[PDB]
Design an enzyme around this catalytic site. Structure first.
Site, PDB file in Angstrom:
ATOM      1  N   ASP C 345     -18.397  -2.338 -35.453  1.00  0.00           N
ATOM      2  CA  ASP C 345     -19.790  -2.629 -35.731  1.00  0.00           C
ATOM      3  C   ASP C 345     -20.122  -3.933 -34.995  1.00  0.00           C
ATOM      4  O   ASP C 345     -19.212  -4.693 -34.634  1.00  0.00           O
ATOM      5  CB  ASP C 345     -19.963  -2.776 -37.246  1.00  0.00           C
ATOM      6  CG  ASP C 345     -21.356  -3.224 -37.648  1.00  0.00           C
ATOM      7  OD1 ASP C 345     -21.447  -4.226 -38.396  1.00  0.00           O
ATOM      8  OD2 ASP C 345     -22.361  -2.591 -37.235  1.00  0.00           O
ATOM      9  N   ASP C 686     -19.139  -4.224 -41.812  1.00  0.00           N
ATOM     10  CA  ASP C 686     -19.578  -5.051 -42.939  1.00  0.00           C
ATOM     11  C   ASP C 686     -20.721  -4.423 -43.730  1.00  0.00           C
ATOM     12  O   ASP C 686     -21.124  -4.947 -44.765  1.00  0.00           O
ATOM     13  CB  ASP C 686     -20.023  -6.427 -42.429  1.00  0.00           C
ATOM     14  CG  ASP C 686     -21.337  -6.367 -41.681  1.00  0.00           C
ATOM     15  OD1 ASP C 686     -22.161  -7.280 -41.837  1.00  0.00           O
ATOM     16  OD2 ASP C 686     -21.568  -5.392 -40.941  1.00  0.00           O
ATOM     17  N   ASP C 690     -21.222   1.553 -42.438  1.00  0.00           N
ATOM     18  CA  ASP C 690     -19.877   1.611 -41.862  1.00  0.00           C
ATOM     19  C   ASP C 690     -18.924   2.359 -42.792  1.00  0.00           C
ATOM     20  O   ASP C 690     -17.785   2.643 -42.423  1.00  0.00           O
ATOM     21  CB  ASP C 690     -19.338   0.196 -41.587  1.00  0.00           C
ATOM     22  CG  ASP C 690     -20.130  -0.538 -40.512  1.00  0.00           C
ATOM     23  OD1 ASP C 690     -20.636   0.128 -39.585  1.00  0.00           O
ATOM     24  OD2 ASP C 690     -20.259  -1.784 -40.590  1.00  0.00           O
TER      25      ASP C 690
HETATM   26 MG   LIG Z   1     -22.920  -4.883 -39.633  1.00  0.00          MG
END
Ligand SMILES: [Mg+2]
Ligand SMILES: *[C@@H]1O[C@H](CO)[C@@H](O[C@@H]2O[C@H](CO)[C@@H](O)[C@H](O)[C@H]2NC(C)=O)[C@H](O)[C@H]1NC(C)=O
Ligand SMILES: CC(C)CCC[C@@H](C)[C@H]1CC[C@H]2[C@@H]3CC=C4C[C@@H](O)CC[C@]4(C)[C@H]3CC[C@]12C
Ligand SMILES: *[C@@H]1O[C@H](CO)[C@@H](O)[C@H](O)[C@H]1NC(C)=O
Ligand SMILES: [K+]
Ligand SMILES: [Tl+]
Ligand SMILES: [Tl+]
Lengths: 39, 268, 992
Positions: C345, C686, C690
């Site tokens: 990410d 995070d 995700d």
């Molecule tokens: Mg992120």
């Protein structure tokens, strides 16, 4: 000796055990010393 | 193939052949040096045989010899081993002044044939007649057990002195020259009868010390025949034969350390 | 099952408000009926998420109790009770042997079960985190009246109302809104507020303004909407199910464990039954044939090995806990070392997740600011009088403020009330000009025009802090081009000057460059109003232009971006040097995604996309050979119409990949694509978007401070300080533990041979038993334990970060080379050293080696209390047994003595001990404690009963010394050959 050779069939397993246990303990302490040199 | 090519399969064989060959050659080398440090006449240690064991001829199934008097093949098993032992004490086996010697027909003192050396030939052993074993096919009824003191090189079995009290209190106490053997069971439902050298219930000290197989082959150890003409029948009787001496001791674990454990039962 | 959920969603934002009501039998104004709502409740079911069915811990524990070694140990434990049963019936055996050994072995299985159970842990509460995002209550309009209801009682069709501060209770079709902004970070990973209005604004429902989603929250304003989806049927409720439902799967390390279990189990059953028949042929009673088998089992199975592995893993996880890297699953300690591909990410992972000033354009010059958290860069300018003029506008023409009580925390980390751009500017000036509040106190704001959608600028009028003036200063900021159309002069190095086409062109150049860097650019200008035309009491009208807004003085430009975390660029390069492929997978827009890719080193300098080639050469993209482009940037909207085979080609054909504007399922798809090619993949993230990717990853790593609760539930590892450098450490630790496990496994296995061989020679030679079953457990469960563990503290023998990731198909944890060395070479030398001491003990007590062959018959005969030795002496039963058990004791001690050397040689696979040294203090500890344990077990009174251990004479200890030394020399010579010729012979045969 002659007829008085009783010592031939004898062994001080008691002392050997005392010494063996002393050694085992001291090796155990020595090990702690070296390990604890930083934790 | 499985792992590798033929060329690789070969090389792995050439290696392990030389490798294991070397290892075998090294192992043998260390065995050589071990043997080189040992005597031919005497073992390095003797503290593990120290207190002599007392063993008998009747091959006990489990420290027990039960059978039926009214049956032939009921005791023919115990007679096999009994024969095996006594067959060795034949007179035809003890011929000429070599390597046997006529010793006192009465319990005597020790005999030192020098040291544990080859500086002399085969150390001459005392003769022993199976004919000293009175009364004892064997006892088809009320067995005639044969006792024996385990051989130990350089061991001088020393009898107890009549200073204080004794089990068989002072009876026929040949204090100076006899290692006694008194069998027991309270529970006194038997009839102990002992046979041996000089008619004594012990081992004649003139057969000691033993010089070992290498320095004394054909050597004969003294026997002590014991007969239990018990007036009882059809019950397990725990009979313990005990030897007494200065160099004789016992253990709760080793039930053969200078003593017997016989469970006779004439279930007839 | 979940293949449906891996697809992009379909919606009804295209319908009119009225049309949408027909579909759901609803009223736009009155809302649903109390009766109709309750009807729909029973129909569709609750607005809730149901957690997936889990496997109870019962079945999880017991599943370990039947994995190769445990199976063999079970066969042994039962076979003990078998022989015991056969005894208790036949001849009354008052002993406890088979009974107790059967109890001991069954305990070994249970305890070993706990260790593997502890290792195979799965702490997963994905669906629980998602459930936390549904509010307890919602506001609905029913029978023309608004009431709060249990949010679970919400159904498709009713009229819902939301306002700033509340969570979207369900997927809504916006029908009415007033200044409504929403935080869609759940779906995008981006927290910038998105406007919501009734008007449809994109074909894509995840981008349109007239849809609001469950799992997000309203940030400001008010909105009303019609519920289109409820519970599991919402967009993120499906993501929830997808994430929670995904099959976990076996880790690389787990697969390795099972693999050597098969090997060792194989040789165990082989030799087991190979000698079971070999005994019956020799005329051994089944009574004995089973007793030998039990011994064979105990000899072949390394009883303490699986627990060693677990402890070595645990200890490695403890070290990483001490670098702010939390491991939730013990096996994930190794996966990072086997990782060949990282899918990362961007926002909050690679980046700080905070709009930060990156560059400034003043004095006809581009200046760069420091974007790093801890400010690890340098200054750009302080001297220029122009800077102070620009700095003043950035502070004054700004409505952002620091939250109360932050004075303790660093400037860049403190919470700010305001939009991202104003916060960035605030923190910029506060950093390099001190307290901004001071500047706003020295220059009192009298009138302002806040940033307007139409004006595209924000202006402010302040009392000049200067005493000699104390007059009125005008400042404004806005779109760079709009600010330009309002300027006549430029503050160059202090003094103003006319805005000639020259500087105007340099402005465009500066503007295009900064924008090309993916940075948001703002214009800044001011105007000192004429004193005579503006008295100290002159009133300014903000509603109607009461003051000039043209012919102003352009001061400068400022650019900003959500920047990389300081450690990220360097960590990315380090991953790439270790041969790990790094891919970006983000919900963010392509221009931003691509710019950070270059910033952190995902896309290296000079590498081009097909679009780059086309623009440079000024040719159509179809005219470009796509193989000429090693880099690519894929938008999610294009990803959607590509098959997996085509996704596989993208993955194969590019070294530098950026997946931008991806949905959560799309991240999962990219991860699966990478895995499909046979790669071990890590995911770093995070956000809740995700979660599926993190779950599917061989190892998911979540950020600890910036991470959402969901992401950290889906992960195997948490970076508690958001230190991306930890990934580099993790992969390094992962590789090190992999090598050290080999060392520890070889060490443990080596001692199997000296435990097997005595039992074999017992049969083939008919000699007294050299070593007992109990004695074996004193080794594998006792003495070898601490030494085997200590190998986990071994330093690397070379630069492990310099090698490529292991090939999980070829590079195994236990291979033929390990067995050859442990079983064929070193263990064989240990066996002999054991036997030697055995022959020494017996020969020194009167039983010379020659007379031992074929004596066991009379030796074991309990009724022969007169066995003749070599010297003609007669032994009772218990007497010779004491010597025999003393043989077991010295054979045992011989193993310990030969394991001394083995421990030292297993220290290194390649290097010499004279190179690696003896700096492992745990290892040395192992040596001392191992020897202490052995001595204690031999000399402690009473151990002759409980373990049949007998006191050894001093000379006995030294029997195996020459064998211990040969091991040290042999292995040292062998490894000397390895190093001296990287060719292959010694290497390809023995190199673990
Ligand atoms: Mg992120
Ligand atoms: C040792 O003495 C025993 C005494 O019983 C011998 O047994 C003889 O065996 C033969 C042939 O089987 C019989 O004819 C005799 O009746 C047995 N007794 C005697 C006194 O001769 C036995 O053969 C002898 N063993 C050896 C090796 O000489
Ligand atoms: C007690 C004694 C008699 C048993 C001796 C067993 C010997 C023959 C065994 C023990 C370990 C074995 C080796 C272990 C490892 C390998 C590597 C593999 O790729 C091919 C087989 C090979 C080379 C084995 C061949 C046979 C081997 C050398
Ligand atoms: C033993 O045998 C002798 C003959 O040799 C006999 O006189 C005697 O009765 C026997 N003794 C016993 C107790 O049966
Ligand atoms: K995972
Ligand atoms: Tl083992
Ligand atoms: Tl082992």
């Amino acid at each position: 000796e002659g007829p008085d050779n009783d010592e031939r069939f004898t062994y001080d397993y008691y002392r050997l055990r005392v010494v063996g246990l002393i050694v085992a303990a001291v090796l155990c302490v020595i090990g702690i010393i070296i390990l604890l040199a930083g934790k | 193939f499985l792992g590798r090519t033929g060329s690789s399969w070969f090389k792995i064989f050439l290696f392990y052949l030389i490798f294991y060959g070397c290892l075998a050659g090294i192992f043998i080398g260390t065995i050589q040096v071990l043997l080189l440090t040992l005597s031919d006449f005497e073992p390095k240690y003797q503290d593990r045989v120290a207190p002599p064991g007392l063993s008998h001829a009747p091959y006990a199934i489990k420290t027990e010899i039960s059978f039926s008097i009214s049956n032939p093949k009921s005791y023919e098993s115990f007679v096999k081993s009994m024969h095996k032992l006594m067959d060795l004490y034949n007179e035809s086996s003890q011929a000429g002044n070599s390597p046997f010697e006529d010793c006192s027909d009465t319990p005597a003192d020790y005999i030192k044939r020098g040291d544990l050396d080859d500086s002399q030939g085969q150390k001459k052993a005392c003769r022993f007649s199976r004919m000293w074993l009175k009364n004892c096919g064997y006892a088809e009824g009320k067995p005639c057990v044969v006792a024996k003191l385990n051989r130990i090189i350089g061991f001088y079995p020393k009898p107890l002195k009549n200073t204080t009290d004794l089990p068989e209190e002072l009876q026929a106490n040949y204090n100076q020259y006899v290692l006694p053997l008194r069998c027991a069971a309270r529970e006194k439902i038997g009839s102990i009868e002992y046979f041996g050298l000089g008619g004594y219930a012990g081992f004649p000290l003139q057969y000691y010390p033993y010089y070992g197989k290498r320095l004394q082959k054909k050597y004969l150890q003294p026997l002590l025949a014991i007969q239990f003409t018990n007036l009882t029948q059809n019950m397990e009787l725990r009979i313990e034969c005990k030897v007494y001496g200065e160099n004789i001791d016992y253990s709760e674990k080793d039930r053969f350390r200078g003593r017997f454990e016989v469970k006779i039962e004439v279930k007839s | 099952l979940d293949e449906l959920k891996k697809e992009v969603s379909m919606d009804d934002h295209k319908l009119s408000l009225d049309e949408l009501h027909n579909k759901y039998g609803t009223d736009l104004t009155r809302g649903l009926t109390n009766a109709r709502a309750k009807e729909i409740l029973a129909r569709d079911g609750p607005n809730s998420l149901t957690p997936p069915p889990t496997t109870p811990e019962w079945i999880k524990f017991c599943r370990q109790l039947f994995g190769g070694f445990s199976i063999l140990l079970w066969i042994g434990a039962i076979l003990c009770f078998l022989a015991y049963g056969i005894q208790a019936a036949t001849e009354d055996e008052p002993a406890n042997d088979n009974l107790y050994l059967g109890v001991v072995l069954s305990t070994v299985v249970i305890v070993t079960g706990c260790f593997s159970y502890y290792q195979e842990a799965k702490s997963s509460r994905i669906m629980d985190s998602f459930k936390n995002m549904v509010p307890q209550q919602a506001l609905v309009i029913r029978d023309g009246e608004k009431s709060t209801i249990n949010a679970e009682f919400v159904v498709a069709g009713d009229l819902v109302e939301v306002k700033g501060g509340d969570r979207i209770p369900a997927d809504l079709r916006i029908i009415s809104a007033h200044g409504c902004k929403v935080d869609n970070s759940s779906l995008t990973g981006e927290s910038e507020p998105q406007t919501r209005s009734p008007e449809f604004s994109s074909e894509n429902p995840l981008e349109t303004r007239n849809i609001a989603f469950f799992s997000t929250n309203c940030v400001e304003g008010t909105a009303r909407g019609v519920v289109v989806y409820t519970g599991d049927r919402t967009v993120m409720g499906r993501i929830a199910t997808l994430a929670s439902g995904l099959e976990v799967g076996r880790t690389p390390i787990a697969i390795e464990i099972e693999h050597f279990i098969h090997i060792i189990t194989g040789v165990a059953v082989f030799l087991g039954v190979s000698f079971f028949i070999l005994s019956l042929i020799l005329g051994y009673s089944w009574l004995e044939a089973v007793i030998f088998l039990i011994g064979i089992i105990v000899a072949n199975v390394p009883e303490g090995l699986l627990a060693t592995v677990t402890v070595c893993l645990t200890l490695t996880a403890k070290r990483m806990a001490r670098k702010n890297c939390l491991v939730k699953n013990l096996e994930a300690v190794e996966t990072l070392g086997s990782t060949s591909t990282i899918c990362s990410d961007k926002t909050g992972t690679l980046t700080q997740n905070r709009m930060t000033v990156a560059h400034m354009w003043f004095d006809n010059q581009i200046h760069e600011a420091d974007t790093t958290e801890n400010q690890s860069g340098a200054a750009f300018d302080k001297t220029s009088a122009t800077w102070s003029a620009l700095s003043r506008i950035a502070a004054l023409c700004n409505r952002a403020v620091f939250q109360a009580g932050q004075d303790n925390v660093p400037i860049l980390k403190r919470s700010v009330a305001g939009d991202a751009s104003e916060s960035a500017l605030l923190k910029c000036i506060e950093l390099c000009c001190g307290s901004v509040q001071g500047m706003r106190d020295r220059n009192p704001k009298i009138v302002e025009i806040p940033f307007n959608s139409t004006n595209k600028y924000q202006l402010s009028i302040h009392e000049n802090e200067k005493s000699s003036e104390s007059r009125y200063l005008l400042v404004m900021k806005g779109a760079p081009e709009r600010i330009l159309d309002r300027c006549s002069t430029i503050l160059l190095n202090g003094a103003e000057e006319p805005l000639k086409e020259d500087m105007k062109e340099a402005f465009q150049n500066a503007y295009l460059e900064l924008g090309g860097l993916g940075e948001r650019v703002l214009g800044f200008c001011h105007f000192a109003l004429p004193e005579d035309k503006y008295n100290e009491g002159y009133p300014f009208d903000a509603d109607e232009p009461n003051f000039p807004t043209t012919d102003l003085c352009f001061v400068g430009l400022m650019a900003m971006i959500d920047p990389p975390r300081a450690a990220v660029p360097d960590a990315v390069g380090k991953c790439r040097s270790a041969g790990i492929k790094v891919i970006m997978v983000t919900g963010d827009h392509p221009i931003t995604a691509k710019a950070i890719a270059k910033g952190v080193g995902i896309i290296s300098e000079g590498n081009e996309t097909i679009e780059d080639i086309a623009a440079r050469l000024n040719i159509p993209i179809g005219q470009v050979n796509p193989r000429d482009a090693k880099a690519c940037v894929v938008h999610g909207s294009d990803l959607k119409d590509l098959s997996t085979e085509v996704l596989d080609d993208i993955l194969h054909y590019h070294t530098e990949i950026v997946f931008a504007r991806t949905s959560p399922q799309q991240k999962l798809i990219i991860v699966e694509g990478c895995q499909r090619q046979g790669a071990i993949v890590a995911v770093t993230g995070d956000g809740v978007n995700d979660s599926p990717a993190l779950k599917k990853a061989d190892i998911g790593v979540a950020m600890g401070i910036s991470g959402s609760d969901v992401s950290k539930q889906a992960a195997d590892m948490i970076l508690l300080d958001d230190n991306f450098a930890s990934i580099v450490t993790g992969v390094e630790e992962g590789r090190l533990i992999f090598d050290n496990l080999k060392k520890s496994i070889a060490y443990t296995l080596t001692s199997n041979i000296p435990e097997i061989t005595p039992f074999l020679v017992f049969i083939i030679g008919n000699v007294p038993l050299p070593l007992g079953t109990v004695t074996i457990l004193c080794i594998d469960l006792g003495t070898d334990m601490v030494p085997a563990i200590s190998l986990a503290y071994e330093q690397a023998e070379s630069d492990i970060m310099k090698r490529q990731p292991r090939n999980p198909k070829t590079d195994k944890l236990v291979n033929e080379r390990l067995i050859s060395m442990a079983y064929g070479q070193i263990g064989m030398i240990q066996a002999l050293g054991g036997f030697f001491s055995y022959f020494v003990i017996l020969a020194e007590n009167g039983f010379l080696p020659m007379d031992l062959i074929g004596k066991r018959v009379r030796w074991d005969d309990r009724w022969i209390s007169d066995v003749e030795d070599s010297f003609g002496q007669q032994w009772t039963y218990e007497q010779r047994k004491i010597v025999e058990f003393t043989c077991h004791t010295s054979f045992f001690i011989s193993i310990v003595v030969v394991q001394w050397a083995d421990l030292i040689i297993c220290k290194t696979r390649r290097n010499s001990i004279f190179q690696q040294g003896m700096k492992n203090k745990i290892l040395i500890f192992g040596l001392f404690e191992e020897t202490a344990l052995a001595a204690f077990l031999s000399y402690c009174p009473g151990t002759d009963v409980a373990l049949r251990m007998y006191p050894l004479k001093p000379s006995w200890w030294f029997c195996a010394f020459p064998y211990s030394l040969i091991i040290f020399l042999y292995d040292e010579m062998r490894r000397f050959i390895i190093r001296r010729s990287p060719g292959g012979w010694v290497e390809q045969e023995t190199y673990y």
